[model samples]
Target: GSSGSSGPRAKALCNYRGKNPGDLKFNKGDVILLRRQLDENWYQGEINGVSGIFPASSVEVISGPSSG
Candidate 1:
């Protein structure tokens, strides 16, 4: 039972050691199931209530869901 978050999912290609409180610290292969594109190089990852920023290029995209 979770809020419906249907969109593009991503995988962590590089291990990120988030240096800030708002940064998303994750290891390689960590499933970034929901993300929001911020800038060209910046992205926001969402896991439940926590939304943090990371490098977009460091992730690989996988098509997830859409309105049907």
Candidate 2:
């Protein structure tokens, strides 16, 4: 569902634990599937009614949607 830090100026991660190659601390690449939106740029998103800026630069975008 909603990943990424709601806190101000926090480090966002690509995965929950940031164990992935390009993972960040508070954002996840696969979150787009849960958020149900995608964009060429990670910042270009409006997920779960929380629009505007999101720290998603560290995440990796995959080709297909998440199966979960």
Candidate 3:
């Protein structure tokens, strides 16, 4: 995704699996899919189906019920 702000940065996924990889920037209104739950506030997700784990702190709810 694109950058949402000109501030620091946003959240994203990388190939690295370190404790704290780095800052991942994402634009506002970018849609990401939830994949697996690592914990309460952390989950593996995908942007455009490219899977990874992102902290729940980096995302916001924008819709209602989801369908499979």
Q: Which stretches of candidate 2 lie over 4 Å from their true place?
A: 1-30, 33-42, 63-68
Residue-wise C-alpha lDDT for candidate 3, range 1-68, written one tens digit per residue: 77443222123333333345642234555545555566767656666535656666666433344568
Model 1 segments more than 4 A misplaced: 1-5, 63-68
RMSD of each: 6.3, 11.4, 12.5
Error of 1 at 48 (Å): 6.8
lDDT of 1 by residue, 8-51 (tens): 67788877755666688777888775556777777787654566
Q: Which should have the higher lDDT, number 1 or number 3?
A: 1
**Each candidate structure's count of clashing pairs:** 0, 8, 2
lDDT of each: 0.71, 0.39, 0.49
Report the C-alpha displacement of residue 58, candidate 2, in angstroms: 2.2
Q: Which lDDT value does model 2 have at 56?
A: 44
TM-score of each: 0.61, 0.30, 0.47
What is the overall TM-score of model 1 with all chains considered together? Answer: 0.61
After best superposition, candidate 2 residue 11: deviation in angstroms? 15
